[PDB]
Design a protein around this ligand. Structure first.
Ligand SMILES: Cc1cc2cc(n1)-c1cnn(C)c1OCCC[C@@H](C)CN1/C(=N/C2=O)Nc2ccc(CN3CCN(C)CC3)cc21
Length: 294
């Protein structure tokens, strides 16, 4: 149970470079130095921006014992925690960054086979969080990490204790109701982010007014690379009836169907010039960075 969350000493890790921030904390590239060893292992460290108390920290250690409990290839597991005056969370390092920045930076080189596979993988991790009765509350392309280009993982889960209005389902904005189906709404918006190559949803619409335009029946438009088959699925994620939104287990299957013939469903200029890596190149990544089961 508590055998998955390691409590760390200040003296056995070091923060070396600022990699990004969030809403409750800044993320650093770090180094883990085990006691009595001469190795320095790269980690990812999240320092909480607001300073907590000694009892605030029993609350943290309760979601930190759960966050360290996720055992899923497409969800990032909390590994360790360091209980300072600003609690520091230790996790595995992803040098490729988040999927949001990656798609902006590689948009001219991303084919349909990658994108559809990511959506399969994202929904697999989220279906796991549903299987684990864990509602994420902040699924977005920025909180999806890229282990290798062929393998993504979801991160930043544990923020109810601690607002991305443009990703939240209508009932969250109106009533603060967060369920697995409102994570489906967040998922459909994340798929939009991928399919538009990192565009900002509702760009120029103030967040204070989005709950209104949603109630009038307005949604995000069809991404130019998307066929209607893909967009209808996204549209089904944004239904005002939460129960009518698709389930993650169904989002997995359908996007699996689309990944077996990717060029029918996403029309990208030059899509014939970019394919998945040969089994040679897939094994090369996996032996070097990505040895887990799937
Ligand atoms: C398990 C784990 C690992 C990691 C993050 C989280 N969790 C996590 C947890 N909650 N939240 C909000 C999280 O994400 C934080 C948001 C940005 C994040 C992608 C940073 N980020 C990174 N993240 C992780 O390792 N790897 C990165 C590699 C490259 C760059 C870009 N260069 C950096 C230097 N500046 C100049 C910009 C250019 C950014 C990188």
């Amino acid at each position: 149970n508590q055998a998955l969350l390691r409590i760390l000493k200040e003296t056995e890790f070091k923060k070396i470079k600022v990699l990004g921030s969030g809403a409750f904390g800044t993320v650093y590239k770090g180094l883990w130095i085990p006691e009595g060893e001469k190795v320095k292992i790269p980690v990812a460290i999240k320092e909480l921006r607001e300073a907590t108390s000694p009892k605030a920290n029993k609350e943290i250690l309760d979601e930190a014992y759960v966050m360290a409990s996720v055992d899923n290839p497409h969800v990032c597991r909390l590994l360790g925690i360091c209980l300072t005056s600003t609690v520091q969370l230790i996790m595995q390092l992803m040098p490729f960054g988040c999927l949001l920045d990656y798609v902006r930076e590689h948009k001219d080189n991303i084919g349909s086979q990658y994108l559809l596979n990511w959506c399969v993988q994202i929904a697999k991790g989220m279906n796991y969080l549903e299987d684990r009765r864990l509602v994420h509350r902040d699924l977005a392309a920025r909180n999806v990490l890229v282990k290798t280009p062929q393998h993504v993982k979801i991160t930043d889960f544990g923020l109810a204790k601690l607002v991305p209005i443009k990703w939240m389902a209508l009932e969250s904005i109106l009533h603060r109701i967060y369920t697995h189906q409102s994570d489906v709404w967040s998922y459909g918006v994340t798929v939009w982010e991928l399919m538009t190559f990192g565009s900002k949803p509702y760009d120029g619409i103030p967040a204070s007014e989005i709950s209104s335009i949603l109630e009038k029946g307005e949604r995000l438009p069809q991404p130019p690379i998307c066929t209607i088959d893909v967009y209808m699925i996204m549209r089904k994620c944004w239904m005002i009836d939460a129960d009518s939104r698709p389930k993650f287990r169904e989002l997995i299957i359908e996007f699996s169907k689309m990944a077996r013939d990717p060029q029918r469903y996403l029309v990208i200029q030059g899509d014939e010039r970019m394919h998945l890596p040969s089994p040679t190149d897939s094994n090369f990544y996996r032996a070097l960075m990505d040895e887990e089961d799937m």
